[model samples]
Target: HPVVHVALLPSAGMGHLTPFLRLASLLLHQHCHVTLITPQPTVSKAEEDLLSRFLSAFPQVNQLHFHLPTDPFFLQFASIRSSSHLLTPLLSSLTPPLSSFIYDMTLISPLLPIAESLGVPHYILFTSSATMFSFFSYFPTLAKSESFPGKLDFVEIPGVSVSSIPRSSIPPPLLVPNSLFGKLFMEDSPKLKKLHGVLVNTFEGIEKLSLEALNGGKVVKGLPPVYGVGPFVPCEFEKVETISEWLDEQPSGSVVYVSFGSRTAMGREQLREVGDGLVKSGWRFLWVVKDKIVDRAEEEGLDGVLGFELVERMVKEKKGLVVKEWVDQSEILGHKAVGGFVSHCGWNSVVEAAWFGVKILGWPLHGDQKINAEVVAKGGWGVWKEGWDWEGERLVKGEEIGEAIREVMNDESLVMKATQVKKDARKAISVGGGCEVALQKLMEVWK
Candidate 1:
């Protein structure tokens, strides 16, 4: 049997790469040969170091490899408008062709036609929720409707009778011109209809209604097939260390784990408030604050005002660790030491926290994050800062952050409720589960 070489292509961002890496790790575990095709000088120097360390750490995993292109798409997009053109030469450089190409949906348009031309199946990987997929699938309709851009109207979806989606929940780009959505859809591109099946990093049961509504149109035809074999973070625990160690140190429901996905960076005030709130809360904590973020925080004099000295003093007094680089977040969330997660509500973070039975303190900065926050908040499994509008200029203060964290962490009933949701979420992705069955059936069609 020839090795099934899967070329996993991700958008050049931490949020995008993390899930793709987890998915690649999953495929590798299944004995499928995998190549993580990323652009070189990837994201940042720190990310590059992390990637190298990860590859080195798992050297015996012969089924896995990293194929870093000389020119990353984001880099190309920086200098050129039609970034897809760069993929041609870079991909052509690979040997013997890939068995399949697993690609980020945002980057798929430029490369899907090329993959089809090469006679390879392209798997469209979405880094967000099923709700996002539903939203994107309806882009054509939204474009034609008068409710677009500056209008807060709900496009009634089938299988979901929710009259209208809050205009605020729509992708900011769609709501504002020169935004990401506008760039992707404003042009008359044929790419939307040409995709293989879409793959979301989500299970079905958690959002049964939304997934059902999305599939009602049967829009994925000719695409590889929409497969939601997710909760991908769980799989990383088997390979990563440190998460277990951190778990052993914290008392049950004692520690709050704080992390924003890789791409999101906060201003100095928010960062200081987060640090200060955590300090003042007097709880065990584990936080990951990247260097770039600290630099940004400094630019606003947050570093001088909030001071790492204060945070360190609190950490020493309160038993907290703030790493400047990375942590095995999935394992941390899954650990008994972790009681709750103060998250940016990135889809992966949300699902990971939900899957691990960790209560959530949601802070949605942008994109689909606000909606993910809403989902958990509405379900009573999490808490969000009231009056912090995703579409408006409202910023959350430290006190509000402390309040949301305390509410989720201290409430026994909320923990129990979160635990049950975790079970439901687990079932959503397990074998014979709604999403698992759908993915299996979709895979069968590939035969």
Candidate 2:
């Protein structure tokens, strides 16, 4: 096959950028030419740089180039709602023309006018869940039918029963009357529906219930086709060489890998509570407490509790260790030592954990995390910290954290179930998997 040109638009964060880059590399490996369009300062650029170095080492998949702008707005706030306007010129460079536009849905709206201008089709590379997209698709109709007072409560979606939306699916804040964010969310339906189809980051087998609830019997109209092209941690099977060597020294199923993605920040109290929870759970851990979080922790005096003495004390007790900068999360999760993941429920992290069969302590911080966690927890493979609040002045207590860890890590049945779920996930996204078929169908629209 001649090179198929794919213009990839990744979100501003690392969790979003990494998997999309992997997919782009896979496309390149398949003899497709790829142009990775990203803002200079967006995490996507960092990924491009790192992947460039990686591809240089591999030599075979070097048919990729990073196209970025020098201007601050495009570089710094690439995913901002306002930055969508800047894509006009950036997308024009993909000549002898693109076969189709494969864009991250978060940044895809900007591509619509560009795609229309170029007479090319646009496809959504959704980083969110099918359930979230289903909710996004149904919001308009739901608003038209919902009763007052009960409007915010769980109203059954058409073709979906009352039992589908579980307690974990419903955040406590949504129960309140006249929620500002909730009202705003319902109002954005018209804008969200303009995209042709969404390429989901989840596999069908893992979230079949949520997909069914979202599909609502009849095929969703106007909604872009859903593609489950994920659990995208290429590092899982690739030889890490550097990080793997270090991780091999740790005890199997003994470490807690804690990360609350880039966009989500944790307060000092929440940080300490997580740290204390690790200590109390008596598990070894590798924590990525970002500088942003560390600053917040110090501001809250919770840093004192999360300091060298505490980490040292825990290490002396054989409990945990803390790191200030970023760690190779995929490699760490794939490590035999990593038994549990204390995650913000970012799609990439959830997919990686599932791929590696690492049990999750789901603490959704933002976006589609809640729905993703709900699927895993209800499927009997993981546990959701349902009442566990990570945003308040108070943190989820160490005992609560410890209990959740014990339930997911110590339970043999859950492990087997989790492993089975992982196997199912692998099959769902593999070549000739349901998602691959969807991508093939999408490519034909261009033909």
Candidate 3:
């Protein structure tokens, strides 16, 4: 068999980058040659470390860097778009080296045309769930038929649901008529129809209905084949010593692991409420808080809101430990002591929680998080916190947070469902697993 060479271009942020890296690792394990194209300016210190560790493990993988001019306008655009602009140059430079290999590239939608022009087979690597992808695939029809930015309420999407999603919960570009993101979607949504296929990071059992709807061709005409090839998470070689020791000491399924991803920042009031809620819940907890400011002016006044004395007191009491650094999230979630997750409902976090059979206490902040939270609640694996006045600046109270925490932790049926989900997740990546089959088919596309 000829070695298949794949070029992968992932957008900025750990959420987008990590999945593609995992996919690259999977392909390498399958005996494929992989080339990774990364933008230089957007690489953060943490991302750099991850890349270093990954390359150390897979020394055969090739790396290419694209330089971006320092300019305000270029920086203001979506990182994917910026990445798309650099694709032509990167491919042009690598053509001679990659020419003899069977060429294929898996990238986000914005880079579709560039890949096409380079005469290589291409796939859309949607790094989120099938439900989110189905919504995006239907955006063109929804924009034309629905009175969006006007109706500003719930509306049904074809094939997927009779149940409607709140207009406010939809991506801002899809809701607003002529906003920048809205305009970008209008441009990119049509391109979805032209792609060869879509590879998603979800499994059949978890999102069977939505996955069927995506492939049914009812939502968009001439849509390519869709594949569920994921729940791709970081593989932990060993647990971090300090965190593992702490988790080992706690009772089984008694601790709640809290994190809001790298991008989300909460106001001081919200942070204080969360602290009080955890304190009041009287549960063993491990919270990962970022040291970055939520809002400079708001954060300036935040020091007095939740004083260090209170935080130290909580640590001294052994009720919880709050650290302002990155810990191994997959390891934490997989721990027997982790009973629940207080998350921002990012898809990656949601998938990880489900994979570990940990119940969710969703506090979604923005973007597809609200939709993910809804999915979590509807599936009966989690509880969503309501009464968030995003515009009014009204935060969810400590009482509400405490109640949600208690609810998810005490629900027996939720635990069973989550356990089943965890089994399904493991199955999807096994030898004859859904993702394994999907990757087999994916490779056949080029042959």
lDDT of each: 0.64, 0.62, 0.71
What's the candidate order when arranged by decreasing TM-score? 3, 1, 2
Tens digits of per-residue lDDT for model 1 on 88-138?
A: 654555554456677776765567667776566666788887766666666
Is 1 or 2 the stronger prediction by lDDT?
1
Give the runs in model 2 whose Cα sits over 4 Å from its true position: 43-80, 143-150, 158-194, 212-222, 235-246, 293-305, 429-431
RMSD of each: 4.4, 4.8, 3.8
lDDT of 2 by residue, 177-232 (tens): 56643454454445555555567777765667555655444334555445666656
lDDT of 3 at 389: 32
- Scored by lDDT, model 3 comes in at 0.71
| Candidates 1 and 2 compared by TM-score, better number | 1
TM-score of each: 0.82, 0.81, 0.89
Best by lDDT: 3
Model 1: residue 273 alpha-carbon error in angstroms: 2.1
Ranking by lDDT: 3, 1, 2
Candidate 2 lDDT at 341 equals 83
